[PDB]
Symmetry: D2
Subunit: 440 residues, 4 copies
């Protein structure tokens, strides 16, 4: 699955549709990012820039100019072609090929942006710019506007109104098209295959990072070169750290291992968590906590649909959690009082769900306490967890248990589609998978 | 292999030894680095900060204060412990454990650095600071010095002399200790095992990124989680791009594939290039170019020793290259004239060797044209290559061939030790390796 | 004459009237400005900040918040009272007295602006801010908006629309109220008295700066402590430099002296130029050039009225100039051709008129080539000049003559009122004034 | 009196003398400074830049390069000549005339400083730069050093040592040459004449600013166009504010007026305070406080000499003050206890003396509590004062009295020379001066 040329074109037109007439929108590319000295991290394009272009180079700027309700055009600034630079660091699109390749009307050299940008903004009323996103972008934009402000004698006028396009653009990104959903569907399968493989490879005495290695290899073999976030492999007490990425410990028989890992496929994030026994067999104490987290997830998967919210479903999860913890003697008291006191918070201290897309924690307005009414096309995670600290004042057997189980879903007309159910989460199915792998 | 507590202590003392009395050296940690939105790249500590500490957290500053030739102390600024932040993002050393853990005299909270740093610099004559390395560091240091400058009435005085410690520290890093050499020796083995595996896995119809996946998995399984640089897998014409990292093409029977890849093991870079046939059998035209690059490497490995230089060995390589290219009809004319005209430069447009250490292109002064006399303990690469452009005006059979063969060496008392010879480079040995793997 | 409390209130309401509902306007005070080391120049408030407040302190910010068409309020941030700081540097209004003194609803400490400003902007749709005016203001505003942008979990939202208020506010300042006109009327009288005195004091052998001293003393004695711009006293060839402020030369019998000087009275600029003979008697050559400049001025004073423009009146001046210069043999050819070739430009290289108000070169849109149709309440200068370079290829007697004659006017319903005609400009009246003074 | 070409040359050589070999010193000019919109304050050159050049333009940089103990040269960067810019804003030295005019070896265009400065610093070991003095200077210097640091392949090397020259240069400025002393002697006379005139002009019902006007006129008529600091005219309770510059009040019969005012003559500051009765006759209560301040001054003038300090003389002043205040019942108790408790500090809350030169509060190290041993050539003020607050709990008659009497002195071989004694300070002489003037 991929995003078509036509889709990128549709998105640009959808942005232009919302823009005032006599305006320009400026969308800047991500800078290259140093890892150490002269070596740089693998390039990751700005998600919003990528959303409108599918162009994976730095030093680029998309300019969408709306003259009126029927008349608009696009200008790309991008790196010029350079034989020496390209022999050394890799091929560049350049200006000639860009209009056709990316469906823009005009392409200019990024090295001329200071000489040309003010001319494109001259006489407009409004400029859409994400102020503070990148310092290099702010310098370029402020410099253009100052030229215009101070160029009265040259008959130049700056637009007096600057609008942040991020709210508009993030609202667009919040609702996935069919093409985006097909891509996220594949990201979900790829990620699921990685998680299955980790379960099948796990043995006592392997290190946490070994499962990371298996996962990343599986991502790569399906064409997802990079993870969407730094992989989490927390065995034992490390499972109680939500974004544990050290992955440095020997995995011990008797411990659980929590894997939070997701591929990046055509820019889109998969995001799965599976927790399972290092030795392939859950203990009673492990099952007792796992079953609460699993019921929370399964109930949420049943409930999520148009017209509810993350807040409303979270309320049900809290009830399931508080009830289960009371039955185990981890909480003491009346269930409804304990709920009213948020007595679950020492053990479940994060949200049930986040938006998912070009960013793993995706853009889009949640509303107060994530109360926004869900509609079809929204994509989100469902990730209940219980994390009992090594030093929690609870029965000894539950201490140092961290369990999270996470699926990715898209809201549909009648409910939701689960993108990540091809990896098992029922404990008996986990155990069968691991037994079968140990034979073979 | 690892770097000991004692070694980090020795390095600090070696820096202090060279410092003026009545001075302080400020070594700042790398910032965290955004990959996209709220997600960050895997943390990579500043190499120089790491060199003196082995401490892998951001928001940290090592302060070495020399009062006189016998009297000095160390202060660390680092992140305070925070239960919520650590539950979320991971464990922190904190102040209590730091003196013992890292062998410093005193540890303070980074959040108090603006309140405390000027007090440590008050009344000193000299401050060693790497100005321009990081903007956050410059703000902190300039702010401290301004307080002192303007604090005459509070009996404060700023040091008037600021010295860049990078030349001193990079000169130290240029000469590897026995411990560092043992670590780089292991990085070389790990990297070699990855390259062998790539050769054994390569088949026509696999993508360039699949060999990347195999390599990264092999790095990871030996405890080297990350590469030291972005892996290069250039098959066909992509082999003519020196830092080709797109790795996006289907590998075709008949093409060569050039793999430049290195692990990062305890901070230290492995760095190997092997070029080989995708189908396991070199053609005549491929052998003809390969043999020139291989003779260049083998001759350089024989020559490199104390008392020569990269420049001097490069001169021999150029002769080998120009002679081979004339025999193939790629160059025409007198060998010595062609050498004097640098007629090899369209086909070999980079240096034979770079320093290797905590950075893959390591710090340390090369001298003009890399003429510095080599001494024992210097670690460097040997990487001749020939890159014939798809459109070069040469016999058709050589067009679009990129070949590089690279080993990592340490200069010894009598010559050099090759750290990467455990992966094959003789063409018949490459072919036997790939045949054996294809059976199975 | 002064500006009333009620007037400042009317201006604020007039700004609020034009603002969108659910918006705030931020108007920042001028910074203190170093002259050398720890000494600062006399404080000059930002003209726009002054326009809305009449408040003459630094570290202050006026915030006008419009909730809707009937509901708005004002918040001032200003310096807190401080006995030690005030004993040392002077009295401060503080917070208690400010509401009553300046007619604002609320006053807060400037030292708390970062803790309070984001709370005032929370949930608004629009912020009016003069971006780039002052760096300290930009830091404060950007910092407030980032808090809001990133404060989703604390139920904070930034206004997405930022509008430059300078066009709106400068359009207001372009039209003077009756109160402003009475103040500028007094500034014109004060400035005129200074110019008369300079003419009466001038003798050969006095320095250019001596007339500056006389002028500044006269400004001061009527309560205008500072000039509105740096005083120009160009005798001889120095009269050909438009903003000659060195004022360092001995004034020589036989030379003319050009004085461009204006007081600052209650913030408003007077702006007069008178050129006259150092020895009290114009030569023939001096009269010949002077009469052209004087006819230009007198004709412009007759012409300026509602419905014409600076451009249209300039056209008449150019004709008068080109004709006069042709009669003297300074220009050669057909008058209408010479006009079409702008042949006057080597001798008259500036505009006839600029807006006048809180700035000597006042704010307000001119239109292309100063073609804006004049309306009642506009205040402007009328300043024709002829400047014949020492090395101009013209008859010897005209070389090194610089003459400018400038009056300040307000456009009325039927024409204009001259604010500066109480100082003489007819040459015979100049000569009589100087003769009478010499007796003284 | 003036500073000779030879003197500026001597100063430069004296700086070069102290510089390390293989070094360059960079001394930058002051920026132009906005007063409001497009109008700028009268230009004031950086004191240190002026000290070495006598050059009064912005956008200039003096570069002194020391190759070794006998070999050095000077390069000036300055504004290029421009007919249009000079016709508009005034004449420029340019490059051709600069070597001869300012005694430098070479002059280059400031517009080429980024292309040329790094070439001048290439291969040096040390750069002397006043870091943080001006932001534009820091940008230029850091930019030059980064080019060198990163220009290894172009055989460029940055100096690794940066030294602040301000301590060295301010130590030089602390000791005035005979030429400087003659200039300050004239500044003292000019300032004295202004103060005498203010006393002679003062009448009840005149405003504080009227005396300011008289003073500034007198400065100007002797060729000192500007004051060295903003003039202080505090009548009544305004005399209790140390840097009262509002000068806005009507001067009332019965009140004292305190005038702190100084000219700037050839860059050098005069600095005098005289306090006197508005009506020409001191009351008993006024005399009682005045006599304490006058004895303090007269005793200090007797005491100041080589080998004492400001601290040591201040101790005597404190004794005189505490004793006088006890006799008046303003302080109660034992004199020596009151001294030990610093009981004078509510009434005398500033230092007796500051260095005087190119800045009114001149550069140079004071030592702890101004304990530095005085040597010949040091120039300083002597300014005791007593300031009794309107609300001080003291006998009613002393409330709201501010008195300061200040002279400027140079330390000589045997004592001091008073530069400002040509204006009267004995009360009977003040009264006679004012009576004589009233007849006017
Ligand atoms: C940043 C958030 C949108 C997601 C995060 N997992 C939370 O629940 O708090
Ligand atoms: C940056 C250099 C030290 C290394 C690079 N491979 C070259 O030879 O040019
Ligand atoms: C800056 C302008 C408004 C005024 C200037 N005197 C000119 O005519 O060019
Ligand atoms: C700034 C100081 C050197 C001078 C000031 N008058 C004081 O005595 O405190
Ligand atoms: O952030 C957020 C969720 C919490 C567990 C991991 N990711
Ligand atoms: O850079 C440098 C060498 C050239 C080939 C890859 N690395
Ligand atoms: O600027 C403008 C006009 C030109 C002469 C002086 N002021
Ligand atoms: O500053 C200092 C002294 C105190 C009075 C005025 N100047
Ligand atoms: Mg346990
Ligand atoms: Mg071929
Ligand atoms: Mg003449
Ligand atoms: Mg009284
Ligand atoms: Zn069009
Ligand atoms: Zn997360
Ligand atoms: Zn997850
Ligand atoms: Zn998630
Ligand atoms: Zn010690
Ligand atoms: Zn490389
Ligand atoms: Zn390599
Ligand atoms: Zn290499
Ligand atoms: Zn209200
Ligand atoms: Zn002007
Ligand atoms: Zn004027
Ligand atoms: Zn004017
Ligand atoms: Zn020389
Ligand atoms: Zn002072
Ligand atoms: Zn003074
Ligand atoms: Zn003083």
């Amino acid at each position: 699955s991929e995003i078509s040329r036509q889709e990128f074109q549709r998105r640009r037109q959808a942005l232009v549709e919302q823009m005032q007439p006599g305006s320009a929108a400026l969308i800047f590319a991500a800078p290259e990012v140093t890892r150490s000295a002269d070596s740089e991290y693998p390039y990751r394009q700005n998600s919003d820039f990528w959303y409108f272009t599918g162009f994976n180079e730095p030093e680029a700027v998309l300019v969408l100019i709306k003259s009126d309700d029927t008349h608009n055009h696009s200008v790309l600034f991008n790196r010029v072609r350079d034989l020496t630079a390209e022999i050394w660091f890799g091929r560049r699109l350049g200006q000639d090929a860009a209009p056709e390749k990316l469906g823009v009307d005009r392409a200019l050299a990024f090295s001329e942006i200071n000489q040309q940008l003010y001319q494109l903004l001259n006489g407009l009323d409004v400029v859409y710019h994400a102020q503070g996103e990148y310092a290099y972008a702010d310098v370029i934009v402020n410099s253009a506007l100052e030229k215009l402000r101070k160029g009265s004698r040259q008959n130049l006028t700056a637009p007096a109104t600057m609008i942040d396009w991020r709210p508009v653009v993030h609202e667009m990104r919040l609702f996935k098209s069919p093409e985006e959903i097909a891509v996220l569907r594949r990201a979900g399968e790829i990620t699921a295959m990685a998680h299955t493989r980790a379960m099948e490879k796990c043995r006592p005495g392997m290190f946490e990072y070994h499962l990371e290695g298996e996962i990343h290899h599986e991502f790569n073999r399906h064409g997802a070169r990079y993870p969407s976030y730094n992989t989490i492999v927390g065995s034992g007490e490390n499972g109680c750290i939500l974004h544990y990425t050290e992955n440095e410990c020997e995995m011990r028989d008797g411990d659980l291992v929590l894997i939070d890992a997701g591929c990046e496929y055509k820019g889109y994030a998969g995001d799965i968590t599976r927790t399972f026994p290092v030795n392939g067999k859950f203990t009673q104490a492990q099952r007792e906590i796992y079953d609460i987290v699993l019921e929370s997830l399964e109930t949420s998967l049943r409930l999520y649909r148009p017209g509810t919210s993350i807040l409303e479903v979270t309320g049900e999860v809290v009830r399931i959690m508080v009830s289960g913890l009371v039955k185990l003697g981890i909480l003491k008291g009346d269930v409804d009082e304990l709920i009213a006191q948020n007595a679950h918070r020492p053990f479940f201290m994060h949200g049930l769900s986040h938006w998912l897309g070009l960013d793993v924690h995706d853009v889009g307005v949640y509303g107060q306490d994530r109360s926004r009414i869900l509609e079809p096309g929204m994509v989100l995670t469902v990730e209940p967890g219980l994390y009992i600290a090594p030093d929690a004042e609870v029965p000894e057997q539950y201490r140092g248990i961290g369990i999270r189980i996470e699926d990715d879903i898209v809201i549909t007309e009648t409910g939701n589609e689960n993108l990540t159910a091809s990896v098992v989460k029922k404990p008996e199915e986990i155990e069968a998978l691991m037994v079968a792998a140990r034979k073979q």
